[PDB]
Amino acid sequence: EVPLPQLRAYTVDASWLQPMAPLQIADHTWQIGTEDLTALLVQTPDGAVLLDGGMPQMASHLLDNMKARGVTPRDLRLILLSHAHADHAGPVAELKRRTGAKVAANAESAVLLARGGSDDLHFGDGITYPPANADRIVMDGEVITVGGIVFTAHFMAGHTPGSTAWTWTDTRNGKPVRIAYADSLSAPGYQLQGNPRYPHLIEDYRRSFATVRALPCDVLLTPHPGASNWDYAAGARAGAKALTCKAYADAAEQKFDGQLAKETAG
């Protein structure tokens, strides 16, 4: 009586995940994701690194744009992420099976990733996806370099205990551009206060706003493009009205404070 993959039935909005070929951001860094979800490929002589991937569908559309930008599965060396939620780490496992890639990630994003997003601090097992093992554990401020480009982890706990920001500089207009890929600072439906699964939640977000402000931030990009008023649907005017870390940050803190305000009502 009806298989296991026969149902199970996934609601899919045909408007999500509308693919898009590489949208260049700098000499070496491109946005190969989809239009509603960041996924930055940065190419290098030694290999290439991917920051975030999006949803689990996206693996083969990402792997496409990695060829449209001259990256073979073997040339994909390293995968970084922002946080280990299904819509940013979704395809990591598959890509690891299909590429030469390995994953670097902090201890708390590694655990969430390895249990596939299950037992989420706020969504339980609703948001469950294909688990992956991390190949390298990173410490706050640790630097990873690949063929000249230098990546720095900045922990910004909040959205996820393991929410990270990565920073690297590459050329572009010939001058350096200090690229801050900052994680979500959102808190959707989250019990903020007296949360037994995250007692320093308010404190952590608080320190993460400050962290994001201080980022070496010529160009901010966020995993949800619109979080920083990008619009990957405006050609070379994507980051035209792109926010700055200070702006992004003060924005989130302001909405956070408002969230908090309504929780402390009754």
Ligand SMILES: CCCc1ccc(Cc2sc(N)nc2C(=O)O)cc1
């Ligand atoms: C009126 C605003 C509705 C809204 C807007 C943004 C979010 C945040 C979401 S969603 C999603 N799939 N990821 C995020 C994230 O924070 O990374 C949640 C809800």
Ligand SMILES: [Zn+2]
């Ligand atoms: Zn998330």
Ligand SMILES: [Zn+2]
């Ligand atoms: Zn998200």
